[PDB]
Coordinates of C-alpha atoms and ligand atoms in Angstrom, one line a residue:
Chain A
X1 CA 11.3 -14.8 -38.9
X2 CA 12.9 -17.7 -40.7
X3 CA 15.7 -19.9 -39.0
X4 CA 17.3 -22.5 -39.9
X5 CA 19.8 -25.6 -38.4
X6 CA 23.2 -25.9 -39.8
X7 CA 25.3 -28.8 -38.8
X8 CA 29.0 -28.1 -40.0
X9 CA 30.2 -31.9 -40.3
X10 CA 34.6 -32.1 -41.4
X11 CA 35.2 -35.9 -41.5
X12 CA 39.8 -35.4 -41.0
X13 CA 39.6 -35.4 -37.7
X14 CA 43.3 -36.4 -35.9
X15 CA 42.4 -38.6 -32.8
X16 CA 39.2 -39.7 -34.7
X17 CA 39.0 -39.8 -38.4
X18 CA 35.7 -39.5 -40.3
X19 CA 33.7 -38.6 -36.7
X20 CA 30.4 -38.1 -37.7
X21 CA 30.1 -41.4 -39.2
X22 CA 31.0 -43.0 -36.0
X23 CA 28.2 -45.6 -35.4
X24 CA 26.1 -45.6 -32.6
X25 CA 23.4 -48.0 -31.5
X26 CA 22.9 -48.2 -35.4
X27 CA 23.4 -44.8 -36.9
X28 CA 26.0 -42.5 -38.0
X29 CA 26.9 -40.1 -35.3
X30 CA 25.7 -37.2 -38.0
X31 CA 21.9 -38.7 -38.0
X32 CA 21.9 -38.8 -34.7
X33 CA 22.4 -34.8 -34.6
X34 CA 19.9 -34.3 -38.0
X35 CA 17.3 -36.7 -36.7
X36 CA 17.2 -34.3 -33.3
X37 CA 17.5 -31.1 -35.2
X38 CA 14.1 -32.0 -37.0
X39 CA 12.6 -31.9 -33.7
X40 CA 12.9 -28.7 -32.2
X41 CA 9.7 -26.6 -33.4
X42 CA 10.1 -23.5 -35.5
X43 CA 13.0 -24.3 -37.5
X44 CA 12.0 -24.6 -41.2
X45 CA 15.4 -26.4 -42.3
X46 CA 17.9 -28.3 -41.2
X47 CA 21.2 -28.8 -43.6
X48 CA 24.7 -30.3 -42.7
X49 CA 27.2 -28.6 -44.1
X50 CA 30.6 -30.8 -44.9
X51 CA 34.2 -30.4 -47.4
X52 CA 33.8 -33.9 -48.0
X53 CA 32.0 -35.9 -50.6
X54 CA 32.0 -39.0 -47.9
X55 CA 29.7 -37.3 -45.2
X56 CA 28.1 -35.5 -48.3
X57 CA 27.0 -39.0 -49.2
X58 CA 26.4 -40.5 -45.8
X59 CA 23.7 -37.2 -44.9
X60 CA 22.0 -37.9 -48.4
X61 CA 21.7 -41.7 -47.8
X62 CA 19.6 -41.1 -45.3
X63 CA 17.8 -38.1 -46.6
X64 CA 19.1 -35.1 -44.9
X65 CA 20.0 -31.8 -46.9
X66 CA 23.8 -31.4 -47.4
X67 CA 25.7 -29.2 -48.7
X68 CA 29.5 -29.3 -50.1
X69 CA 31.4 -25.8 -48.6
X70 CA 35.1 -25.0 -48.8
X71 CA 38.4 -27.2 -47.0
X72 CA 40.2 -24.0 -46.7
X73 CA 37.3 -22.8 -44.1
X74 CA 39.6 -22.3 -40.6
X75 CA 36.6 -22.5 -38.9
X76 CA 32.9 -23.8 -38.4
X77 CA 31.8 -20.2 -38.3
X78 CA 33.5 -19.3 -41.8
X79 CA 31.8 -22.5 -43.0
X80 CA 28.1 -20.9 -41.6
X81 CA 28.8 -17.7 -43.6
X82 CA 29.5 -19.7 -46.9
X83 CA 25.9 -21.3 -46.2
X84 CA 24.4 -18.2 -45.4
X85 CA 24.9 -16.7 -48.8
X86 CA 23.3 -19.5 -50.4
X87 CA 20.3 -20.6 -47.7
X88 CA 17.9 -17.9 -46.8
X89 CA 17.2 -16.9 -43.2
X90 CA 16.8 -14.4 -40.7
X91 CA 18.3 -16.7 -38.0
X92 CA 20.7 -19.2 -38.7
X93 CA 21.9 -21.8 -35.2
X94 CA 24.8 -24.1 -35.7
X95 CA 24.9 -27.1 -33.9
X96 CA 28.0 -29.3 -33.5
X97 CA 27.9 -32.5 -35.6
X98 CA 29.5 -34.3 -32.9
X99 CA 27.0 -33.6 -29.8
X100 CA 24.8 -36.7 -30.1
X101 CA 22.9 -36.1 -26.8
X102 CA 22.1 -32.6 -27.9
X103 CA 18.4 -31.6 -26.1
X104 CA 15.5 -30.6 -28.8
X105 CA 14.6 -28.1 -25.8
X106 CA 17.9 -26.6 -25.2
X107 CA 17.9 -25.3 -29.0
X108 CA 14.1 -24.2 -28.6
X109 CA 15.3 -22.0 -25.7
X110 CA 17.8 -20.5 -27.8
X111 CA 15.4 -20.0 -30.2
X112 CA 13.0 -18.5 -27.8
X113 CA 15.8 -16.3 -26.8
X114 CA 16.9 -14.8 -30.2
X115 CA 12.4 -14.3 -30.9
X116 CA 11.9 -12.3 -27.7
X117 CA 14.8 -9.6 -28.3
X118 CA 15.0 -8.3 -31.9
X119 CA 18.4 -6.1 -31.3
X120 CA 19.8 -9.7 -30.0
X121 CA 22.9 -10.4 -32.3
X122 CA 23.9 -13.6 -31.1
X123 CA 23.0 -16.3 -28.0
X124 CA 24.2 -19.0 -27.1
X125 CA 24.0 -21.7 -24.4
X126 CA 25.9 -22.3 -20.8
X127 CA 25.2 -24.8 -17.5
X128 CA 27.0 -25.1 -13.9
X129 CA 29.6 -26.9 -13.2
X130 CA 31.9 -27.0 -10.1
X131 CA 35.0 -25.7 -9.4
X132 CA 37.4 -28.9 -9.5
X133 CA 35.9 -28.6 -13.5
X134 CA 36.3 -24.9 -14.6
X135 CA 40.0 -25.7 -13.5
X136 CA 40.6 -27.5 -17.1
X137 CA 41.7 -25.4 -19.3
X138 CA 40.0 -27.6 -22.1
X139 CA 36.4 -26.2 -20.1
X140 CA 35.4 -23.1 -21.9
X141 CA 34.0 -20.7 -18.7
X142 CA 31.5 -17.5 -19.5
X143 CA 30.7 -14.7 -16.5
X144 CA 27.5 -13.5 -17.4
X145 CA 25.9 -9.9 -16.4
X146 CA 22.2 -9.1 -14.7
X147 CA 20.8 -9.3 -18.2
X148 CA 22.8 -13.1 -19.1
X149 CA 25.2 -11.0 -21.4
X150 CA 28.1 -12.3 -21.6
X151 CA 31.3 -10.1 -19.7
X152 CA 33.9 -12.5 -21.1
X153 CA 35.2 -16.5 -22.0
X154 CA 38.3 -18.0 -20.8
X155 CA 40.4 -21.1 -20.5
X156 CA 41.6 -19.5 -16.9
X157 CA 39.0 -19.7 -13.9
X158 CA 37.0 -16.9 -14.4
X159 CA 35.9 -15.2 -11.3
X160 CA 39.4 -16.1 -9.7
X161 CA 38.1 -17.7 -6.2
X162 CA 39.3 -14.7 -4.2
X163 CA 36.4 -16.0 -1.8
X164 CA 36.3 -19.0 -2.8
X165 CA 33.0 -20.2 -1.3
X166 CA 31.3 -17.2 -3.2
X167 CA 32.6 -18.3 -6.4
X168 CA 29.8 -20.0 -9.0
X169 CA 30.8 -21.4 -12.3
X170 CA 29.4 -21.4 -15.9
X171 CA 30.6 -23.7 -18.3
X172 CA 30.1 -22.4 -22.0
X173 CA 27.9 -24.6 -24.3
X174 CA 28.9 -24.2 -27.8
X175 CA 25.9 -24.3 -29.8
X176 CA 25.5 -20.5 -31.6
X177 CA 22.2 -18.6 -33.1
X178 CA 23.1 -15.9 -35.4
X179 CA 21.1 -12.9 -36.8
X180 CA 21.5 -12.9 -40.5
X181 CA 23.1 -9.6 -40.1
X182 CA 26.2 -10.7 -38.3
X183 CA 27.3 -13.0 -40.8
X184 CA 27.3 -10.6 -43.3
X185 CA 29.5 -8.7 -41.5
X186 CA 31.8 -11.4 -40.6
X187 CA 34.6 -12.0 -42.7
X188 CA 35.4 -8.3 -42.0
X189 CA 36.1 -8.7 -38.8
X190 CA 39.3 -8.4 -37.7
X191 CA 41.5 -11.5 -35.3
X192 CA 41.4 -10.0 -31.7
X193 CA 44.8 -10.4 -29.6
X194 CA 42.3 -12.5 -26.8
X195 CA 40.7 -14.6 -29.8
X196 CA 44.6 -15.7 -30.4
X197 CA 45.7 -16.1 -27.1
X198 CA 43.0 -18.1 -25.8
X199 CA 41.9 -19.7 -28.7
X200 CA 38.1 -18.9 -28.9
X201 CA 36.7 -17.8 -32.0
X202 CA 34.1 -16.4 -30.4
X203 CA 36.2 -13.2 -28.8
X204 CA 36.2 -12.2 -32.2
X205 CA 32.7 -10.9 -31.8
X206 CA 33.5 -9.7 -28.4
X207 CA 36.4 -7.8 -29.5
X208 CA 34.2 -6.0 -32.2
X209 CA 31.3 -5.0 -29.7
X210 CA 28.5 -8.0 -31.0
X211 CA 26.8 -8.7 -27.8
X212 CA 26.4 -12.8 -27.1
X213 CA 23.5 -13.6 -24.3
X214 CA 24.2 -16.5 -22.7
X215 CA 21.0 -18.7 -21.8
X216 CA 21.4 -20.9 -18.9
X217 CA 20.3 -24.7 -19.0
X218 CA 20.8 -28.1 -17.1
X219 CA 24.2 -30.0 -17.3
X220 CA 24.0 -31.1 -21.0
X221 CA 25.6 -34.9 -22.5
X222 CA 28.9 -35.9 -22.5
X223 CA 30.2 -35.0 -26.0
X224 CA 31.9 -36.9 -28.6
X225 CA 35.5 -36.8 -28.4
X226 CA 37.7 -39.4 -27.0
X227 CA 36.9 -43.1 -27.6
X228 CA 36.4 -43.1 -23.4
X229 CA 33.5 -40.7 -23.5
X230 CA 32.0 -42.4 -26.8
X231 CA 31.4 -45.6 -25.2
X232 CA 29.5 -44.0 -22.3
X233 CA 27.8 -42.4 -25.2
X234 CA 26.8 -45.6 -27.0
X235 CA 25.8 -47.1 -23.3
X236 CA 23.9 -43.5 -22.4
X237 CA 22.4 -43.4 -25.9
X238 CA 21.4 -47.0 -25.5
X239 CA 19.9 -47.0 -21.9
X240 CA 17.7 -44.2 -23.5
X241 CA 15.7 -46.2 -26.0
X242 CA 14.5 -48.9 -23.7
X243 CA 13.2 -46.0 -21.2
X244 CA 9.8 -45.6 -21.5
X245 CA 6.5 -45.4 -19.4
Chain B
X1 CA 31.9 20.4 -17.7
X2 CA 33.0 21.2 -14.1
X3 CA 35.5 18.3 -13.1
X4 CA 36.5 17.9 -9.3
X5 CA 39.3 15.4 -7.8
X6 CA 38.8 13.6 -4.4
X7 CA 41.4 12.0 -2.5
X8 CA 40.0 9.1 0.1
X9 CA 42.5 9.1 3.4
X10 CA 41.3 7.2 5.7
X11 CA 44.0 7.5 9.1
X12 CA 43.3 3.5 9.5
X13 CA 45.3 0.9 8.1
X14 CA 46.1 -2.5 9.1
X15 CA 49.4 -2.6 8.7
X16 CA 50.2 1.0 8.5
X17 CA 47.9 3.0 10.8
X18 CA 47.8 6.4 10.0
X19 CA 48.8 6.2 6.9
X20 CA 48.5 9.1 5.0
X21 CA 50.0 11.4 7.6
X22 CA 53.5 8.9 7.3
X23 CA 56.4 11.1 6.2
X24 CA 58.0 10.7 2.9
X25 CA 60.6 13.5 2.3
X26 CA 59.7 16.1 4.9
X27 CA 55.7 15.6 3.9
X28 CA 53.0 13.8 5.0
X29 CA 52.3 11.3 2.1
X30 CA 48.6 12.7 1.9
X31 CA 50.4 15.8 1.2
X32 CA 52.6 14.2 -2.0
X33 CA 49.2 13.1 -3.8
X34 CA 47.4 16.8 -2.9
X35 CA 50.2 18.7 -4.7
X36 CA 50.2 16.5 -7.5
X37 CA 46.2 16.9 -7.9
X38 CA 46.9 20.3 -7.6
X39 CA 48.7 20.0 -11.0
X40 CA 46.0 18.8 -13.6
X41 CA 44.8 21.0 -15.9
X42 CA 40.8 21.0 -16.1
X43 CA 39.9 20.4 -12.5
X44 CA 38.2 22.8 -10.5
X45 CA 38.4 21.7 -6.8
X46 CA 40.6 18.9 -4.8
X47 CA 38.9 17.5 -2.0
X48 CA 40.5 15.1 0.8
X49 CA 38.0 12.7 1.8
X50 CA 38.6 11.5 5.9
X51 CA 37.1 9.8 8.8
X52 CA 39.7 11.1 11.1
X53 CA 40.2 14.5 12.8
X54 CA 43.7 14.3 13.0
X55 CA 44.1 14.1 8.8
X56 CA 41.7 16.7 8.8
X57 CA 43.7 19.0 10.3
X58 CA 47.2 18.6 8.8
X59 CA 45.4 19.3 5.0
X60 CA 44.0 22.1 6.5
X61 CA 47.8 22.9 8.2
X62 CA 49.2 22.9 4.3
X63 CA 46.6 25.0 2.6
X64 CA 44.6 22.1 1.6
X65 CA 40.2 21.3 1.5
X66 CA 39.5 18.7 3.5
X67 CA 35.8 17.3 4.5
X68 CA 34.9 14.9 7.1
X69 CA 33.0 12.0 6.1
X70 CA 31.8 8.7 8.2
X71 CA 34.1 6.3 9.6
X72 CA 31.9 3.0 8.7
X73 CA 32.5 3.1 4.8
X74 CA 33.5 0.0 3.7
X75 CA 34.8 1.4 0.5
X76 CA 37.2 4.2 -1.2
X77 CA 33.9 4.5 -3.6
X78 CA 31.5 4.7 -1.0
X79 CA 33.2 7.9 0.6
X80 CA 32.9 9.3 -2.8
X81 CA 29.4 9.3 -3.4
X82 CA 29.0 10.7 0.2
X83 CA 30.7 13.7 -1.4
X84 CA 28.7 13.7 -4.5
X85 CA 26.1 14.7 -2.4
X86 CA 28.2 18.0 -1.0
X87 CA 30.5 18.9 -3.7
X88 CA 28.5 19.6 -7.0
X89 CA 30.2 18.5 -10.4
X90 CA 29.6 16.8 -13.7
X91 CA 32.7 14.6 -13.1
X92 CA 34.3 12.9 -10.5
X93 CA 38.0 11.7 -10.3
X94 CA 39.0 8.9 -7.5
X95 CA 42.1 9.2 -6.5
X96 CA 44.2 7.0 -4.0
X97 CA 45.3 8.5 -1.1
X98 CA 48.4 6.0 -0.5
X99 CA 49.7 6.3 -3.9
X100 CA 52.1 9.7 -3.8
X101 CA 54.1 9.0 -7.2
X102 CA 50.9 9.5 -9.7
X103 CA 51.4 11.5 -12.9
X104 CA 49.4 14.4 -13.8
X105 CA 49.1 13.6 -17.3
X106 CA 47.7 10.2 -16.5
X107 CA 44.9 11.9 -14.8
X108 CA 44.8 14.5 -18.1
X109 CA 44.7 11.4 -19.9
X110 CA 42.0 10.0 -18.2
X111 CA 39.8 13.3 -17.9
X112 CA 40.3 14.1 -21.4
X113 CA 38.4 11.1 -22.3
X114 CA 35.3 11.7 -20.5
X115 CA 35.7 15.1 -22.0
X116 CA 35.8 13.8 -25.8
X117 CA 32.3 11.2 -25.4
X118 CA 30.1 12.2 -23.4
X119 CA 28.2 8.8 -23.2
X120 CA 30.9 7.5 -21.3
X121 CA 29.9 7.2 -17.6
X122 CA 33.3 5.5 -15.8
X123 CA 37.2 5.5 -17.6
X124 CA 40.2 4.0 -15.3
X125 CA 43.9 3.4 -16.1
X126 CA 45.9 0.4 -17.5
X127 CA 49.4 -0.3 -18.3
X128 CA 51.6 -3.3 -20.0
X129 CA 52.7 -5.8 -17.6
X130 CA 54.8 -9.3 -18.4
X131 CA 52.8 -12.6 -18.2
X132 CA 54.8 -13.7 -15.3
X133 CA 53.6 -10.5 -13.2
X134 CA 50.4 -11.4 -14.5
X135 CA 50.3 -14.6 -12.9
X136 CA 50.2 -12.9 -9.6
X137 CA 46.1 -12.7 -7.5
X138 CA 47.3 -9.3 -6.4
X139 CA 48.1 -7.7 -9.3
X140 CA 44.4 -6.9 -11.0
X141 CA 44.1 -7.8 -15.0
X142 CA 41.7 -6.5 -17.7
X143 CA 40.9 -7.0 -20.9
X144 CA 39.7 -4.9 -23.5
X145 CA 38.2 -4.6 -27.3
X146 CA 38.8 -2.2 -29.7
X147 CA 37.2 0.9 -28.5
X148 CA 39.4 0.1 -25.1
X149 CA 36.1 -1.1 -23.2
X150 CA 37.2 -3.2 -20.0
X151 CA 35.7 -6.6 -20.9
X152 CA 36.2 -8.4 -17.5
X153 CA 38.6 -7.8 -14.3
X154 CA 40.1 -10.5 -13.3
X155 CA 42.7 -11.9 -10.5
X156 CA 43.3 -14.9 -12.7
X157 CA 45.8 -14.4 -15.8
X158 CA 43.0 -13.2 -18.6
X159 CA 43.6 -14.0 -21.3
X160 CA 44.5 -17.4 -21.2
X161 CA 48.1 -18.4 -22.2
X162 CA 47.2 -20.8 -24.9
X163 CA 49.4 -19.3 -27.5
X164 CA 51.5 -17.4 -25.2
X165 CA 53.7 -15.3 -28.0
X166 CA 49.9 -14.1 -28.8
X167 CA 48.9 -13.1 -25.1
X168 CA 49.7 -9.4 -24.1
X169 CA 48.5 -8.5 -20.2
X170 CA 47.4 -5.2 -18.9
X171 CA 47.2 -4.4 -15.3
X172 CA 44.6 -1.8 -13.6
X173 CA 45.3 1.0 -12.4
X174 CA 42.6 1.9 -9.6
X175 CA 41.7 5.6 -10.6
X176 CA 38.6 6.5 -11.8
X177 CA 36.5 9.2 -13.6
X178 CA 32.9 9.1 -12.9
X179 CA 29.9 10.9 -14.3
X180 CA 27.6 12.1 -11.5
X181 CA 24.6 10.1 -12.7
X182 CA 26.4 6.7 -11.9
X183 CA 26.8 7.9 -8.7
X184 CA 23.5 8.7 -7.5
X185 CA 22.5 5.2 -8.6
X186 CA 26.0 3.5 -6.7
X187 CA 24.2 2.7 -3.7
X188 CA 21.0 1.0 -5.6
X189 CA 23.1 -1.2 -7.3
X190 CA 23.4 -4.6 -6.0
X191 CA 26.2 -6.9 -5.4
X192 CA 27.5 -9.0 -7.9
X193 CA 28.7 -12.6 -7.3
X194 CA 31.5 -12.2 -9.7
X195 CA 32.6 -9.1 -7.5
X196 CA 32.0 -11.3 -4.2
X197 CA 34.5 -14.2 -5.4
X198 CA 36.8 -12.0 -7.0
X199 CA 36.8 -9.4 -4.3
X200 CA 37.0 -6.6 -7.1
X201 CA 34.4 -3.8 -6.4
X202 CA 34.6 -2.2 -9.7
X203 CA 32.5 -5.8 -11.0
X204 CA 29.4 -4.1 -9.3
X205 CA 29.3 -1.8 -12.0
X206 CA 29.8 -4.6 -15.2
X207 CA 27.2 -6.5 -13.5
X208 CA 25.0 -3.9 -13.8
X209 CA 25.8 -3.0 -17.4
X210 CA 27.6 -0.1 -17.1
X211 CA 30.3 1.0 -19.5
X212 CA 34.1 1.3 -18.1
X213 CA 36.7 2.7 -20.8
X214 CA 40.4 1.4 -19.9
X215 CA 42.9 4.1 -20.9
X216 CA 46.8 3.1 -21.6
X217 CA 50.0 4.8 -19.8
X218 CA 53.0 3.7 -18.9
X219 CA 54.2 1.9 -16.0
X220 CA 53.1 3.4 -12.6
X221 CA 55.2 3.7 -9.4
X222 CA 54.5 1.7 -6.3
X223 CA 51.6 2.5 -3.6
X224 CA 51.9 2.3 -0.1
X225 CA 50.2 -0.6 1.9
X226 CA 53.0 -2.8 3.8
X227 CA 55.6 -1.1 5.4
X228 CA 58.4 -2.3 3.3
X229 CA 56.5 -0.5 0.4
X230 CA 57.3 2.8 2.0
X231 CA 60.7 2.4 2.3
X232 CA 60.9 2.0 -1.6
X233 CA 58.8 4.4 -2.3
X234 CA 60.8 6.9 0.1
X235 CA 64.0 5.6 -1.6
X236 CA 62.6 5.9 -4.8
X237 CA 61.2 9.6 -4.4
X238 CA 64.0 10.9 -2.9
X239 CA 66.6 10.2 -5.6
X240 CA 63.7 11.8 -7.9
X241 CA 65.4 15.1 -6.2
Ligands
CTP1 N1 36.8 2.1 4.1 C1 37.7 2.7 3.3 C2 38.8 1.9 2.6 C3 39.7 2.6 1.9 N2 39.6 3.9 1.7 C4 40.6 4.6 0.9 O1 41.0 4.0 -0.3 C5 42.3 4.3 -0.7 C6 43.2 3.1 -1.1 O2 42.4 1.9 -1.2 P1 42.6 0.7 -0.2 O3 43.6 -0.3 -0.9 O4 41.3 -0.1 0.0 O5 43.2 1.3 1.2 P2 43.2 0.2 2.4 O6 42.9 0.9 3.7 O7 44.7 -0.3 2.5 O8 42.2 -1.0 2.2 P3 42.7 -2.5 1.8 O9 43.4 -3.1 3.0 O10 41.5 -3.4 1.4 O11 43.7 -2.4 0.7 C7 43.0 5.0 0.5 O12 43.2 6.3 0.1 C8 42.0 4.8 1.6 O13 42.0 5.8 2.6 C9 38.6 4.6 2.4 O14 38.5 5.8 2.3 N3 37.7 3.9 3.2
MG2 MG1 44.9 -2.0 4.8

């Protein structure tokens, strides 16, 4: 059982261009990821894959495997299937090149996850959060069954708080493991109407029947992407390599 | 495949006690929903489902089954699998007892498709609604995929309005179909915090992994819970004449 870590890295990015070669506490935001990747146990490679010749060069400067994909990908799951045809596995996890603070643990639970159930498809990742933050329509929420299978993912404040007090809420962690399989079968899949409306990729595989089990872990880093939550980054990043005893 | 129809009629009502013995037309509204049972093809036996003597009596006054069940139910569903355990069949169709203006070829709809996969253990209704009704906590939305499998249930507007031309809503209608397997293992099944917030029983039975099939029909006529309901409803069925 072979898996592998791709890091889909797009430098044109609108309110922060060229991203993942942001620098923090002395490295580009993209080595930060790779360096981290390397560390969770039973992943045999870890490649970047970018549609520019700038983060192409950045990856390679420091070592790390990259490889050039297409600029007409409209996603970072297109990009994965691109990969796939070219870099063997029978488990392939993308990670977001601009999640810093990502936990080596975190992917080895996912990892775990995918190992112990063979007919698993696809997993990913999801923590609590109140209620005042599953109001934000920018917060991705997930309702999970007895067996952590995902029911649904919405923008909206899913379960409504009918009885409020009752109501517990899962934020949706957007880091993916894949069975070889499902990639294959991707680019047949058809848009779902909820995958449009919402805007969640994902829903795609919902609408198709691929079951997603959502594993449940603590309140992850802030994520890169206003110039507000970078700094805390930097500071957070920072205050955590003068910590030891 | 022996197919039976139960009607749950409770007499009490918080705003409308004794319900479904209110007139509508010359006819007890319990009455309305009975005939129309009575009408789809495939069934073998309507049964009224009550708590109360008095309801009891008037089906029996009409030419109707009736069968006494307990009076501390919390649920429509609940009184249902306390007839499971009388009134043998393969499937069973839930019915509401306030909702007189049902169509019999939305529950041939609905029986036809447990009758074409037999895997399926629960179908239930849906029809188009705009996004503004959808906005409503009352009003019940669900989502499906492309074999029509409910997704979620939901009070809040699912899905998501992000690209609103893109966003079509369906509301749920509350009948059901269920195999008799998923309801001699109702009252094991535990409840779900989803269902608890939401306040939607039919989440006990996601939770648990169970399959529910959403079938599409066309708009559906009011039910009667508030007072003001019945008028319309009496108004509305009326002119039907
Ligand atoms: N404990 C209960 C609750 C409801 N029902 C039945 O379920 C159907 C409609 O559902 P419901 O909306 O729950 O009826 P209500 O009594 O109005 O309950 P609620 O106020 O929660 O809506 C009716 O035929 C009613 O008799 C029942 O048999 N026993
Ligand atoms: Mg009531």
């Amino acid at each position: 059982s072979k898996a592998v870590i791709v890091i889909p890295a797009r430098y044109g990015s609108s309110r922060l261009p060229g991203k993942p070669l942001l620098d923090i506490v002395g490295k580009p935001m993209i080595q930060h990821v790779y360096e981290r990747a390397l560390q969770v146990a039973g992943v045999a490679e870890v490649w970047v894959a970018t549609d520019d010749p700038r983060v192409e060069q950045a990856v390679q400067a420091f070592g790390g495997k990259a490889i050039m994909t297409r600029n007409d990908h409209e996603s970072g799951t297109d990009r994965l299937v691109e990969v796939m045809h070219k870099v063997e596995a029978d488990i392939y996890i993308n990670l977001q090149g601009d999640e810093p603070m990502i936990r080596p643990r975190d992917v080895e639970t996912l990892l775990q996850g995918m190992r112990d159930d063979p007919a698993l498809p696809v997993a990913t990742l999801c923590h609590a959060i109140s209620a005042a933050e599953a109001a934000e329509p920018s917060t991705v929420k997930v309702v999970v069954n007895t067996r952590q299978d995902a029911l649904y993912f919405s923008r909206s404040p899913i379960p409504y708080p009918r009885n409020a007090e009752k109501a517990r809420y899962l934020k949706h962690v957007g880091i993916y493991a894949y069975r070889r399989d499902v990639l294959q079968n991707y680019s047949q899949l058809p848009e779902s109407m909820p995958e449009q409306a919402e805007s969640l990729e994902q829903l795609r595989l919902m609408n198709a029947g691929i079951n997603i089990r959502t594993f449940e872990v603590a309140a992850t880093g802030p994520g890169v992407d206003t110039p507000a939550c970078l700094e805390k980054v930097r500071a957070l990043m920072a205050q955590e390599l003068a910590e030891n005893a």
